[model samples]
Target: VSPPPPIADEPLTVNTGIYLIECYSLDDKAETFKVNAFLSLSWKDRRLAFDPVRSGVRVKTYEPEAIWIPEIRFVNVENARDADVVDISVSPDGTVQYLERFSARVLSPLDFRRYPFDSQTLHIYLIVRSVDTRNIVLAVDLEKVGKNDDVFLTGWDIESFTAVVKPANFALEDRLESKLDYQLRISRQYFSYIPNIILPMLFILFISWTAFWSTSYEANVTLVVSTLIAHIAFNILVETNLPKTPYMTYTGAIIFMIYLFYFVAVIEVTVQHYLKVESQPARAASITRASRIAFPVVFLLANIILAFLFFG
Candidate 1:
């Protein structure tokens, strides 16, 4: 009916753990992930203490409504945690253990700078607010904090599930609040994008560079302009699939660089045609020959700098 009678002036400590059961449906645009996990809580209540000899049982089970249970909720959850109580067992010493399987859509910020090759620390914030003048604080049980080996995310690899042992004790609305951090570290699965987007994009840029091998104005226009259009299509396609971020992503920067390359290729082709029409065939031929080697060299080195700037 109420929080356990405090033994002294100290606040009650509720030990907690989250064991991830299933992790999936990571939405970048929504900035949320659906999680299914078992939440375990342990606390002591002097009032719930009983003698084994009198009860004829070492432990007793009670409905959640029938006993004092700390009301714990999440801080960054999209909605109330949909949880089903599994068990509530009290030992002779009044140590209460509660377990529940909960499903929630948890919100966490994502950094897109290294996206598609990024690692993220997703948080599940467990918090217990002051309950009717009763102070309750949270603690992490290392033994119970882990994830199921069967857990799988569609485009992500689970790295580790760890808890911050320290509680964030703070004040809100003139009430004491305790919050615990449960971090789920994950890295994006980028191998799929290597073939699906990266390689194809590189191929299109290389195809655009092939225009440097000729001085035929019409042929050069077709090659340069066509590849530019293809790059445009690819850009739109890639952007549509990803959440639009204010800061540029590594892949986004590379895509924009490729646009500049395409633009330069168009300019060179135009210059070659202009000089050839201006009756300066020698100058036109020299510029075309110079571009043949410089085109790929600049592109390769520029890409090296761009990649290192990101992954480094």
Candidate 2:
């Protein structure tokens, strides 16, 4: 028997062009951020989807928005009604281009382990709903696309941006179906963290350590307790910005170390006070003097080990 006629191969070519206007209002507590951008989609149809170019054609140009197109949506969209301004154009060569401008809040999972020193990858996905990759292959072209710096309002700097296409499986779909994935990768700036979060916390930790230098046990108690309260408040502030996880983060470790230092200072002060009350002024003085040196030395060493453990 003769072999069946070879099946014709028909594949759609989809290219995405993005102009990221700005990434502002990154709310770590909410795990969401607002992005403003212009998105363009261009595709060619081998099936001659558009009317042939002719001089007598009254409507030489057409907008694809007037008809049904791909039902691409953002899977991680937080806003219920994220709106888009759509425009479409058709060329003589059966090519159609769709442009959209969007401003909405999008969700992104963040890793704040390095926290103020941390860098993050913010992703914006355009998923083709209920479609398998076998029928549609998507791609992004970044040759001329770029960010507009003037509109970038987020404290984090934009280090780089890229586009990638991949396959994604949604739980809402049948077991075998795959979604066409278009991803916009955003790299954030890290230098801003130093001034905003790192330096201020470091200064507070320095003040907590100063309790070791005070001669009066009452004065040390006051300083240590005050510092403890401040550190706890700071920890709470950072905690709200981070998602709950079983593993301790870098910032969490640093906060824990600070609490330990304050606790040690209070314990040392209590011991010194008891020795003074027992008519052992010389012993108390010696212990106090040793702590003045030892407290900072131990703190420095612990930091060295912690830095090596976490960052190295």
Candidate 3:
């Protein structure tokens, strides 16, 4: 039998590094997060590799985008600057490393039902523009990324980070080819929101229930209306911080339930007003006293059930 044809040449290997500097301005409506970072790319080329100690050429710099480098791009970048040529280090084995630093606005999916207690994963995806992975393979240099310590952000702590590599199947020339992806996972910290939005809202809800103790119908009416408006205002405040979506979130459910409670209180106050006018003073007074205790109990029980449904 004839000898099999020689195997085809393998794809070029591209290793990447990500050094996060700072993140700011998480715009929910736009679904974007801004960040500044340094991106490094390293690879080996037999033709470029030499004994650097003898050749006395340890490093060089060039405009990689202007050359025949891999077509890797930040898929989520809304805005980015090419910046300056940072550095290119060449090892004795002929490995070439390139570094680029820039400020950018990156896109991410936002989920805010949990609001203050919510965590988000910010992704930095490097997608190969070419349709064929056989001509280029992308890999992340975990050690290089780990050695960097440029990450910093206000109001958010880094919970954890991870890198993922996957194939992006693309169709070109009516044929399927493999493209590569490099993803960086950055998780947000959320403990500070508890006091800022959650606890304060709960306190407001308790104050609204106090109106049940007042004996005057006019006073109760005023209180009910004011509390209803307050609930609506608080709802707006929370919504402003979150992306608009059709799906109901946990914090949204709480706010909606609070609105329902205020609405019921309004109807109860109206009923008591009618009872006093109809000369049933005993029943009207009884409702006022009973609600002082019953409303809190009902609110507590309703929340207990809701919490279970939400968390369980």
Candidate 4:
């Protein structure tokens, strides 16, 4: 079969719409999503026109093989879409309306710079190549471009799912192309991360700071070194769940910053032991006492700054 002939010099127009049924299986590591939806397409073909009164049928349904159908596919989908044609109805005026249910794993990149506290707009691109018979343009039928009220995505809040009204007209490998962008917005659920990673990490760092209240060098070594190891353990656990990305994340920055704090604290501990051994008890006491106040305040201030930097 071939593409339906155009009216005149105008390119063939294929009116399309999407109605999402279920959106789930969001794999943050793989940057893909499994979506089940309804795709509707409409076009005109003068060849299929018939007289309703003579035919005794208002609208006729036919197998896809009976007439020409446009090939519309997802440009960002993995493999190919699992699709089943639900209906193909042609009107007396030769207008064809198509409906299909499809499921596919779609590829979309995520911005994780502020991960665990990030929001993202995922994309699904629809495209069609122009046939030799006629160039085709896509049109959005707003009435059918929507989602079911019961449509849901687990582990994340469902935001608006919208289609861009304008289609991108471009050339690809000497062929004219028409593309549409469907955007799905979502925010991360971060309640568990704070309790599991952040509060425990702070508790460990705070325990290490308690060495400032003592004069024992071996005990201080155990304090800072043990907590530093615990922090590293948490870092491994965090990295295990994430994919390797080139850019630094907000939490990654904080973790790296904490290493510096531990290193600087080690210097203070070393200086205190040096002064105490050199018979300068008074100087060692002054420095340890100053650190007790300075460490907490500085840590608190740095955390506040990081929070603002990421959130704002």
Candidate 5:
């Protein structure tokens, strides 16, 4: 019989750039031969599969070129939306393994592989979606498999492995910290998306700024006072949404800065009103000098009080 035609390379496998994935084997059940590995996602851009339609059900049999079909289960990361579904199956031939189904647009790289033996091959297919129309593939390779059993997924032994994968770049410590750090970052993004906190805080600051437009001195003073009250109220409101932390946070700093600017603006307008309206020159001068000193001094005092008092 004539030799069979060669199978064409899968588009995802061909296009995707593979890199070393640092994984932690959390539970290697020696009794069951079951290895549970947690994917230490150092950092991955949505490159697993940029196109959903193009990345689904890509199957391959284990030939000399390929090894075994791998299955992905349970992504426990905070940013689960960034990951795509991956299902894998092994063929009867032992040579032919299949990546049965995967769909992705932008897979933000989830899950890592664990091995029973030091030198083992695994096939993983990914299904991911993209918010934008970009054609890409998330390719991963096992760079080095060592004796690592840290639950937090930090600090791996560096100098004891022979069989490694390609793109051997990246320090072990840098990789672990990146994953831990990204989790906090993803949480921050979730906080940013919360409507109640962001919307009201923005509106409060806007209103405080708007207080500058009142026409008369009496109106300006009244509105500024009202705004200061509202600012404090909003400060409290925003604080309620955040967890109590010891050190100052980025959000807290922003709010304080805005309040200070508005407070300073208030003093400017108050002094301007006194200069424009006071009838007697001497009396006007006196009020002006008093306001000039009081404005800055009071503003500074308010900031000190806020720095210590406001817990949010």
Candidate 6:
């Protein structure tokens, strides 16, 4: 058999030193991918600045839209930045041949993202200290390696974080916070805009019929049932997209309140019909008027309560 063609030589190499890793929240997912970050290699120092590529090997973003913050950290290779130094830049392609990788392909609107607030883009500076104390040369600009979604391979975790090599921690660095901080921040950002639009629309669409439905008990039942179906559909949509949590979600709370109102409306119609048939038509008419007056009061109170519960 003919010998296989010689493999091509690779570019840019590494010896030994600590590497920093970080993950940024491009979506609302609370958990980061559970995998090691893939590193890219390149010899050309075309641009003085290095861009970091993030390719999480085993981890993936679970709820990209729900997560509020993304971060970057470090990985120690051998000694802390002590090898022969060269320029660095981030690329989606890490020289590793066999490993597959993945990046986030968020489907929702990312227009609301906030850097260092909702999302973060980190610059890992690999400060490799030269053996001689007299001087130090930058080994590589770690940012060039941070990867985006397009070039990422398949095997890597979709929600994992990658290293963004940064300067060695010596004097003082920025204040460190936990993943929960990011999650809460993201949650606040998400709630601030989404619930206001969704809740009012749902109430108006589902409950407005209380004013127009026929006096027949069957008509009232039909209206409530239809509204329930619509809410159920909306719930399914949210379940598919957002991460499941222990507490009720803002969507769940508001939908519940509106659904409760619908059920009550159905019950009132039944009572009104019963009163009419048992006693008198004139009494039933009077009863219906009273129920109508009470309906708005009940619905308004529910709205106020739910608004406090959800927003407060």
Point to the candidate with the largest TM-score. 1
Best by lDDT: 4
If the candidates were sorted by their lDDT against the true structure, best first, what order would they fall in? 4, 1, 3, 2, 6, 5
lDDT of 3 by residue, 2-96 (tens): 12112356656677777766667877667787766777878655543355556534343333343335556675676555675687665667566
RMSD of 4: 2.3
- List, residue by residue over 4-32, the lDDT tens digit for candidate 1: 67567677777888888888788888789
Cα TM-score of candidate 1: 0.91
User: lDDT at 250 for candidate 4?
Assistant: 86
Evaluate model 2: give its lDDT: 0.66
lDDT of 4: 0.81
Model 1 residue runs over 4 Å out of place are: 55-65, 132-134, 165-176
The local lDDT score (0 to 100) that residue 55 gets in candidate 3 is 54
Per-residue error for 286 in candidate 2, Å, reads 3.2
Per-residue alpha-carbon lDDT of candidate 5 for residues 76-158, written as tens digits (9 for 90 to 100): 32232233323333333222222222221221332112111112222222332211222222344344222334323322222
Preferred candidate (lDDT higher): 1 or 5: 1
lDDT of 4 by residue, 1-312 (tens): 655665576777778888888888888879998888888888865654565664644346444664667777787866889879787877767787888898999899988998887888989888885677776787777788877667656667777878874445454453446478888889888898889778888898888888999889999999999999998987887787776678888878888889999999999999999999998999999999999999989988998999888888
Model 2, 1-312: lDDT tens digits are 112112345435466666777677888756788878777777656443555656366455675344435556676786643457666777776576777777878888777666655667777766653344325445666673545655655556556666665556544434223433334444457676567667777777788667656667777788878877887777677665456655777767877787777777789889988998888989998998898888778878988998788776
Each candidate structure's count of clashing pairs: 0, 0, 1, 0, 18, 71
Candidate 6 Cα outliers beyond 4 Å, as residue runs: 1-30, 33-208, 211-213
